[PDB]
């Protein structure tokens, strides 16, 4: 079973004048200028993050596969969601070596847990292997 | 300084390179644009005509104040010049790459100038004494040039 | 082979002087000159059939369609409102659409 995840705005809330100037990054900042076009909510430029854009409480932080991400660092950390395999999905951290990744991947198959980094740090077996 | 690109088949290519060459970038950038893609024998003929002012080098991008000439008809550029120093430097690199090709055993009559790129290099400063007790900068514009010749084959 | 449709002109979107709502498209059906002839067409099918010049290496069809339904009259001149599965591209303004004879009520 999987609910219908509905997003009220799929774009990105870019910073004001971030397109014209390279010193101004795209991370959002509220314009506090007294004469700011965006803060005053003119026509055309009236797009600000507001709490009304929040997604449904039921389907928040849910990956498109329908499960919630759960980071794991070793095989023992998988046992904390071994009883919730229908709600959580494993996620091997970015610093786990390739050797320890094999143990996590082969253990999660035993415990029937979905892993999202199952194709990470694979050896050269891509062409002629 | 590494090369911008690598040849598809290292067995059928030759390379030549010059670093910190004491020649103007803007002149050599436009010259190297003209000889890109033509055969080695044709390029050597073209570069020799440029020296004696018999074929133009169209200054397509850096054309601020460049005069117009009668040889710039058909190139979609109204401006061109005859950079002698930059043409000579490329002629020495084209010759060097050819000798590299011959040592490899390639056929000179089949080679083309497939890849040729010019990059900016570190400048050298000098003093220009201006009025009212001022000094300015009198800076050179050297460049690196990379040349790669490959045989032409049907695809 | 035979004509089982009436040509309708994609006039534009339901709009105001300085706004525009591309959810509702406005159509002018050929032969409907007043709002009293609109009730027959309320609920019929409308298709925007367009041609795309695909390449030999693609299996995508060269002929595609966008379907919708005529939902309500618009003004006293026989203009109608239609809602489509995907909003009509404004590049298709002034083009011809098909008004079918189904879902029938006769």
């Amino acid at each position: 079973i999987k609910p219908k995840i509905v997003k009220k705005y799929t774009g990105h809330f870019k910073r004001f004048d971030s397109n014209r100037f390279l010193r101004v990054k795209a991370s959002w900042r509220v314009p506090r200028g007294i004469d700011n076009r965006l803060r005053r909510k003119f026509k055309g430029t009236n797009l600000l993050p507001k709490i009304g854009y929040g997604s449904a409480k039921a389907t928040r932080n849910m990956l498109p596969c329908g499960l919630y991400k759960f980071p794991v660092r070793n095989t023992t950390d998988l046992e904390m969601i071994m009883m919730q395999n229908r709600k959580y999905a494993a996620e091997i951290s970015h610093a786990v070596s390739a050797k320890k990744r094999q143990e996590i991947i082969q253990r999660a198959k035993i415990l029937n847990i979905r892993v999202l980094n199952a194709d990470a740090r694979i050896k050269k077996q891509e062409v002629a292997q | 300084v590494k090369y911008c690109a690598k040849p598809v088949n290292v067995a059928k290519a030759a390379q030549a390179r010059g670093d910190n060459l004491k020649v103007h970038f803007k002149n050599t950038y436009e010259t190297a644009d003209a000889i890109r893609g033509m055969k080695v024998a044709r390029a050597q003929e073209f570069l020799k005509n440029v020296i004696i002012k018999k074929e133009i080098v169209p200054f397509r991008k850096h054309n601020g104040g460049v005069g117009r000439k009668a040889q710039c008809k058909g190139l979609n550029c109204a401006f061109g010049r005859w950079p002698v120093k930059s043409a000579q430097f490329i002629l020495k690199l084209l010759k060097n790459a050819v000798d590299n090709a011959k040592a490899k055993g390639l056929n000179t009559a089949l080679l083309t100038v497939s890849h040729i790129a010019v990059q900016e290099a570190r400048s050298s400063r000098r003093r220009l004494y201006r009025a009212h007790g001022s000094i300015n900068s009198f800076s050179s514009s050297p460049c690196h040039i990379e040349l790669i010749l490959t045989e032409k084959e049907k695809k | 082979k035979c004509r089982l449709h009436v040509n309708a002109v994609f006039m534009g979107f339901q709009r105001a002087q300085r706004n525009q709502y591309p959810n509702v498209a406005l159509l002018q059906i050929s032969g409907v000159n007043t709002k009293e002839d609109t009730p027959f067409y309320i609920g019929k099918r409308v298709a925007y059939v367009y041609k795309v010049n695909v390449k030999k290496g693609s299996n995508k069809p060269a002929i595609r369609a966008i379907f919708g339904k005529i939902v309500a009259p618009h003004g006293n001149h026989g203009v109608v409102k239609a809602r489509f599965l995907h909003n009509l591209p404004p590049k298709a303004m002034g083009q011809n659409l098909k008004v079918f004879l189904y879902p029938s009520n006769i």
Binding site: - | - | N7, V9, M11, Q28, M93, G94, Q95, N96
Partner: protein
């Protein structure tokens, strides 16, 4: 489908402004228009009345460079095009595409002289005008401001009128013969079965 055929409007006995408004809307609806005899349109006001308006129009001109300034076309076909272009969207692809499907001519050129001519009832001069109100043909106004080819058109139209006179006379002869032949078939006994069906629905 696709509207490939061309709507031909006979601009004779019409009003310049009201023709343009109807044509401008339908140009945006994807139709293709060709307005022939764009010189025979009518406008309100006498010749002196129209000349005063023209001289005011001629005043507008870029002071520092008249070549950049407003261009005052004098050919009546270009007086209609200006009127239509004013009722179309400006500075977008929709406006330019709509105007691309419009042509005026001062007469009936070769391809459009044998095409079905239409009329715009809202723009007819016999409906919108008091008969006592004085009008001005666009051809007559064009001559007063410097349109050189007014008499060339008057020559070309004259030969078209006489050429259409003999074609119509021959067609009226054939049509009368075909009409009387059909009467004999209708009155014929062998076609009795087919005639009654037409008479039942009033066609016969």
């Amino acid at each position: 489908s696709t509207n490939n055929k061309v709507t031909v409007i006979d601009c004779h006995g019409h009003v310049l402004g009201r023709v343009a408004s109807v044509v401008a809307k339908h140009l945006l609806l994807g139709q293709k228009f060709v307005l022939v005899r764009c010189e025979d349109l009518q406008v309100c006001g006498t010749l002196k009345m129209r000349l005063v308006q023209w001289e005011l129009y001629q005043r507008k001109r870029v002071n520092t460079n008249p070549t950049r300034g407003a261009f005052h076309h004098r050919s009546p076909a270009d007086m209609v095009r200006k009127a239509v272009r004013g009722m179309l969207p400006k500075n977008n692809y929709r406006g330019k595409l709509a105007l691309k499907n419009l042509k005026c001519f001062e007469g009936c050129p070769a391809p459009y002289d044998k095409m079905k001519k239409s009329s715009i009832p809202e723009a007819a001069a016999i409906y919108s005008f008091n008969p006592t109100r004085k009008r001005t043909l666009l051809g007559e106004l064009g001559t007063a401001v410097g349109w050189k080819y007014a008499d060339v058109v008057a020559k070309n139209e004259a030969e078209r009128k006489e050429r259409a006179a003999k074609w119509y006379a021959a067609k009226q002869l054939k049509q009368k013969a075909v009409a009387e032949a059909k009467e004999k078939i209708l009155a014929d006994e062998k076609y009795k079965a087919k005639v009654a069906i037409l008479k039942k629905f009033g066609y016969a």
